[PDB]
Amino acid sequence: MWFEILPGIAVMAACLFIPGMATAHIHKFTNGGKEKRVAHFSYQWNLMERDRRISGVNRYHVTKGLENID
Amino acid sequence: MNIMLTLLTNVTLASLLVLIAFWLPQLNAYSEKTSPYECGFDPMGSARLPFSMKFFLVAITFLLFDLEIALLLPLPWASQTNNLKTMLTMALFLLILLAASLAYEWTQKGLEWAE
Amino acid sequence: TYKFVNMREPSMDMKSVTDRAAQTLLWTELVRGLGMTLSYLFREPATINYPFEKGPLSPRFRGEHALRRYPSGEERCIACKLCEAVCPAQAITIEAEPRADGSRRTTRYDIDMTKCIYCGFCQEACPVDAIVEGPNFEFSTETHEELLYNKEKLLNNGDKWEAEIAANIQADYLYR
Amino acid sequence: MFMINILSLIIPILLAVAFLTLVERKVLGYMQLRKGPNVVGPYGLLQPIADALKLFTKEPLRPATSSISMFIIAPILALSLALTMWVPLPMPYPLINMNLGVLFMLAMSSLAVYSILWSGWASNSKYALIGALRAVAQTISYEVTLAIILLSVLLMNGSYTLSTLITTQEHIWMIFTSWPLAMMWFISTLAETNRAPFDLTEGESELVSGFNVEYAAGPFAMFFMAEYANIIMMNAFTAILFLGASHDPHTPELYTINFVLKTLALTITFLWIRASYPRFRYDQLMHLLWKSFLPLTLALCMWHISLPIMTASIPPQS
Amino acid sequence: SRGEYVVAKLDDLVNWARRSSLWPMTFGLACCAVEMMHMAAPRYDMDRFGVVFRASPRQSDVMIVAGTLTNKMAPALRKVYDQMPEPRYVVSMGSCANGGGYYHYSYSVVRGCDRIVPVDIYVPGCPPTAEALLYGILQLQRKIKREKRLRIWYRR
Amino acid sequence: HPAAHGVLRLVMELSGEMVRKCDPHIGLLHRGTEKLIEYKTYLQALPYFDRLDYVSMMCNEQAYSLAVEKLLNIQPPPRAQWIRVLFGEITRLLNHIMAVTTHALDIGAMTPFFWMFEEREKMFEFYERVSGARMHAAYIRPGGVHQDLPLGLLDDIYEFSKNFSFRIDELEEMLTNNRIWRNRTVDIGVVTAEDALNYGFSGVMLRGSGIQWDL
Amino acid sequence: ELVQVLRRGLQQVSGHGGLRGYLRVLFRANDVRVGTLVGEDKYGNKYYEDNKQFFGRHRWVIYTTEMNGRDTFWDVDGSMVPPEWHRWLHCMTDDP
Ligand SMILES: CCCCCCCCCCCCCCCCC[C@@H](O)O[C@H](CO[C@H](O)CCCCCCCCCCCCCCC)COP(=O)(O)OCC[N+](C)(C)C
Ligand SMILES: CCCCCCCCCCCCCCCCC[C@@H](O)O[C@H](CO[C@H](O)CCCCCCCCCCCCCCC)COP(=O)(O)OCC[N+](C)(C)C
Ligand SMILES: CCCCCCCC/C=C\CCCCCCCC(=O)O[C@H](COC(=O)CCCCCCC/C=C/CCCCCCCC)COP(=O)(O)OCCN
Ligand SMILES: C=C(C)[C@H]1Cc2c(ccc3c2O[C@@H]2COc4cc(OC)c(OC)cc4[C@@H]2C3=O)O1
Ligand code: SF4
Ligand code: SF4
Ligand code: SF4
């Protein structure tokens, strides 16, 4: 044997691992590595657009801290 | 926009698979080969003849019961209202009448297939 | 003397009713069937590694036909034609004449292997143990003509399989 | 870069389906006291590749009495919809983030039946028609109950967003709250995926091949891939719904591994069930779903509406 | 030549896939079908060679004629043979299918199924054992290995 | 068709899936056996009875042998008769396994077939040891049996027979109490005792209807 | 325990003459069991037994890679067994 079934299950498990890990890595890569922002409601979208406007480089992910207050 | 790209990608992949399936192999189509299959003997009548539905009344009933899920699907948002006593009375009222509809069809022999 | 297979009445007590309700709602017998299949999953399969591993056979096994010889190298067959008379499929064709030394021998001995039913009646009928069904069963051909055996093919089969055929006969002839 | 994500979701799913077939054969074989594929590759690891290469190099046949446009469109629709159902699943992050992901899966699963319907009708043969009509009856049997079960379960979530289900089950699996709903949901998924003991449309002993009897080569391979991708997808949906893995935002791979293990357990349970039971009769399936599951589901829906208000347990979202 | 090497490799790959995945039609006529069942049973387990039964002729690669073919039945056998997509193979199993066998001299029996369809492998016996049928199946696999369609095409 | 159980052409008139009429067309395996028998001797005709019902070979041989022995006014010896009854019961096991498992396979329960066909294989081995053939043995002859049992066959038959009841138990665990199996089998194809008698039924088709008759 | 089963596996790979012989037997027969060499063939076939296996798996042959004229590294069949080893292998007798 019954443990001769295991190689196929391991191949299938390895194949099923890839989508979630790939999505997480691509989200980190394109979002600055700080996770992809979630916008279920228009308030979150407004926050994202404000972030893009004030980022100075048109990227919502770039974050401006307290080094912009003179 | 992302969902449109996803749909286009999936349909394109499936269509490419069909195109490979139809253009890669060697085709030797002849009349005996393309004839309809009925276990070795030629079919008697047409497959486009009327095929009786014995569950026809359940099929009509499914139309009404399917529309009741549309009425019950906004229930998660309705639980956030201040008038919970009114809301709960309406939610239960709709499910009781739904069950009563099923009880009437069941007792009056509506769920039995025609012979 | 008989028994009934479906003449049992169910108990009507509350305990019995609750057990049956649990069986209906929680699907106990279905879990029993799942347990049986799960049990079989952990057993050793009965499969054999063919062609490396073979199925057991017997000295009485009926296989491909062969024509045998005496230890001197002289053929055993004397063309009595009893095998041809007894064959229920009429699969045997025999022609005979006196040999150059006056011996009673065959000039034609054919077995149509696609007529043969592999019954073994011919080796029972043979009075000198000339025709046998040898142990071989792996002789599938790619054409129909290769299964129409003449005397040369059957004598070659005898020459090729004599070592095993004699050992099979030695192990079974006291039951015959 | 989103295209790379689409491909990284599509290709591994197809590979998992190809090997799922090998797994089913091996599990069924060992449950039947035999071995199953173990020659073509070590432990049969190359058997799915041989099957795929054989099916895509054999002659595809177009029936003489068939309607070609539907005949060719139906397998395309089946496979494309099977691939599309995966995009809102959070593992732990979805490719597409939807407010109503559950409704999206409901609607696309409803649209997937038309592949079987149109395939059976456009084959223009009697067995294919009988299989298509069995699909009609099957959908009528399971759809209402499945929708109401989903609503009853998601009354604990507060929304139809699939990622919220991770937050809902942070401390306890939702199967400890609604196991009576989980049993009926599992059986309804068996019916919805046309799996034994509910595999009426194929009807192999009874209808020879059912709906796709006239399909050969690549088109038949596409139908098979769609069905197995649907098996995996529905079991992943159930795993997300009822057995919620804990998610660490800084180590999402732990959630991914846990979720994949649970999905494999549920798919293996599907294969286990197929080897244990006889096939239903399709009117008996309708009567099971309408006379047993429907009343219990209605009652449990009322109970799950009342319980959060009874105990002041209403979930957050609007 | 590079082209000849390429067609030889593609030839081997296609031949390998076809032999590895042989699907016989679920089809049995008489006594021989029982031994066919014993080939699918645990002891031999034809499934482990990649050999799975499928009812539909459209999803089948091999037809095993396992039993007597009568005159009444010959049109149906020919019809389900013609509905197999190509490439397709026929294995003749048993004396009845090979040449008529015990009923060779009958008014209602076809004297060999190769009068109706072309045959690749003739499996002798009445019935052939499950092991003998398995030997014939592996011989058919070996024969499929020897085919060189691509090489022939290139040479043309 | 897989459900056909051989070369059977069943023509059905259907309203929806309801069966309005069944017309079994047979003769797709008519080989003209009886005329051929008229062209053979009594020993040459025996292997035909092997191939009549290919799941109960020695039972058919026994029936034919009894007919010929009755016509010859002779008597088989006692050891031969005990061998005949023993192998008839082994053959009944073979036939009942085949029937029950193929019935379950049609219904949809594919698993018990594989469990029981290993046992069938062990009984085929018994057949082969005694006659040299796993199926068409031709062992039972109008005078008794062809050959005496080999010197260790009874022990192996005993070893097989002391394990078979557990295999029957596993089959019954799979099928007897399953609600799906009962739904597919209870109240299906009900025949009354008088109808069974008039239509010419015999065996189980009688005994399931309460008629107390075993030959 | 499980560890002893793993040790059996490692002594099985060690018992076939190294990793490459292990891989050769796995790809040549889809079996990696170790048995007592009963004998060899004049054509190169080797015959092993293991009486602790159930009946059917207690005797086997590893075929030669080179029969009369043809390469039999992959192409093997049951007809390559000579009649004496044929009698032993199909359990017609107990004596090799
Ligand atoms: C995995 C999913 C993605 C896959 C990614 C790759 C996509 C592959 C594309 C899918 C198609 C696969 C088909 C492979 C075989 C080729 C079939 C066809 O295209 O070739 C011939 C095309 O040739 C036609 O006869 C027409 C040729 C010329 C007439 C119009 C073409 C004009 C183009 C100009 C060419 C001149 C040089 C161009 C240089 C760029 C048609 O021959 P035909 O016998 O019917 O079809 C059967 C093919 N067989 C023989 C292999 C079985
Ligand atoms: C991006 C990729 C696109 C295409 C993808 C297609 C899939 C990739 C190709 C996969 C090939 C794997 C199959 C090859 C495995 C061969 C197995 C080997 O054991 O076969 C041996 C012989 O090998 C074959 O002769 C050659 C097989 C490979 C031939 C070359 C393959 C080249 C692949 C190139 C891919 C090109 C794709 C083209 C489209 C883009 C003999 O074994 P056999 O005798 O059976 O064994 C009988 C059983 N016994 C041993 C127990 C008795
Ligand atoms: C304090 C208030 C609490 C509220 C109440 C909570 C307690 C509720 C107690 C009852 C719960 C029961 C739920 C079960 C629902 C179905 C029960 C049922 O009756 O169905 C059966 C039939 O249902 C089945 O047996 C299904 C058949 C198919 C079985 C397929 C495989 C078996 C399942 C394998 C394991 C399932 C694992 C599910 C969980 C997966 C994790 C998500 C009825 O059919 P019949 O026996 O024929 O009789 C009715 C007509 N005379
Ligand atoms: C599918 C598996 C695992 C087995 C079962 C099976 C085969 C191959 C072929 C057939 C089959 O079962 C069906 C149904 O029962 C009989 C009974 C028969 O006689 C006992 C008979 O002889 C033609 C034929 C049949 C069918 C048939 O063709 O492999
Ligand atoms: S085995 Fe029977 S059928 Fe074959 S040749 Fe001998 S007597 Fe004739
Ligand atoms: S083989 Fe025997 S029975 Fe036949 S002709 Fe020769 S001696 Fe007579
Ligand atoms: S060859 Fe023999 S076993 Fe096979 S069908 Fe004919 S009579 Fe029956």
Curated annotation (Swiss-Prot), chain B:
Record GO terms (molecular function): NADH dehydrogenase (ubiquinone) activity
Alphabetical UniProt keywords: Electron transport, Membrane, Mitochondrion, Mitochondrion inner membrane, NAD, Respiratory chain, Translocase, Transmembrane, Transmembrane helix, Transport, Ubiquinone
Keyword hit for Translocase: yes
Coiled-coil annotated residue ranges, if any: none
InterPro entries: NADH_UbQ/plastoQ_OxRdtase_su3 (IPR000440), NDAH_ubi_oxred_su3_sf (IPR038430)
Keyword DNA repair: no
Main location: mitochondrion
Transmembrane segments: 3-23, 55-75, 86-106
Record-level GO BP terms: mitochondrial electron transport, NADH to ubiquinone
Compartment(s) of residence: Mitochondrion inner membrane
Membrane topology type: Multi-pass membrane protein
Reaction equations catalysed: a ubiquinone + NADH + 5 H(+)(in) = a ubiquinol + NAD(+) + 4 H(+)(out)
A single cellular component GO annotation: respiratory chain complex I
Superkingdom of this protein's organism: Eukaryota
Pfam families attached to this UniProt entry: Oxidored_q4 (PF00507)
Record-listed E.C. numbers: 7.1.1.2
PANTHER family recorded: NADH-UBIQUINONE OXIDOREDUCTASE CHAIN 3
Function recorded in the entry: Core subunit of the mitochondrial membrane respiratory chain NADH dehydrogenase (Complex I) which catalyzes electron transfer from NADH through the respiratory chain, using ubiquinone as an electron acceptor. Essential for the catalytic activity of complex I.
Record note on quaternary structure: Core subunit of respiratory chain NADH dehydrogenase (Complex I) which is composed of 45 different subunits. Interacts with TMEM186. Interacts with TMEM242.
Family: Belongs to the complex I subunit 3 family.
Protein name listed in UniProt: NADH-ubiquinone oxidoreductase chain 3
Protein species of origin: Sus scrofa
From Swiss-Prot, chain D:
Keywords on record: Electron transport, Membrane, Mitochondrion, Mitochondrion inner membrane, NAD, Respiratory chain, Translocase, Transmembrane, Transmembrane helix, Transport, Ubiquinone
Catalytic activity annotation: a ubiquinone + NADH + 5 H(+)(in) = a ubiquinol + NAD(+) + 4 H(+)(out)
A Pfam family hit: NADHdh
Listed name of the protein: NADH-ubiquinone oxidoreductase chain 1
InterPro entries: NADH_UbQ_OxRdtase_su1/FPO (IPR001694), NADH_UbQ_OxRdtase_su1_CS (IPR018086)
UniProt record similarity statement: Belongs to the complex I subunit 1 family.
One cellular component (GO) term of this entry: respiratory chain complex I
Stretches that traverse the bilayer: 2-22, 68-88, 100-120, 146-166, 171-191, 223-243, 253-273, 294-314
Gene encoding the protein: MT-ND1
Species this protein is from: Sus scrofa
EC number: 7.1.1.2
Molecular function per GO: NADH dehydrogenase (ubiquinone) activity
Assembly information from the UniProt record: Core subunit of respiratory chain NADH dehydrogenase (Complex I) which is composed of 45 different subunits.
Function field: Core subunit of the mitochondrial membrane respiratory chain NADH dehydrogenase (Complex I) which catalyzes electron transfer from NADH through the respiratory chain, using ubiquinone as an electron acceptor. Essential for the catalytic activity and assembly of complex I.
Compartments reported by the entry: Mitochondrion inner membrane
Membrane disposition: Multi-pass membrane protein
Biological processes, Gene Ontology terms: aerobic respiration; mitochondrial electron transport, NADH to ubiquinone; mitochondrial respiratory chain complex I assembly
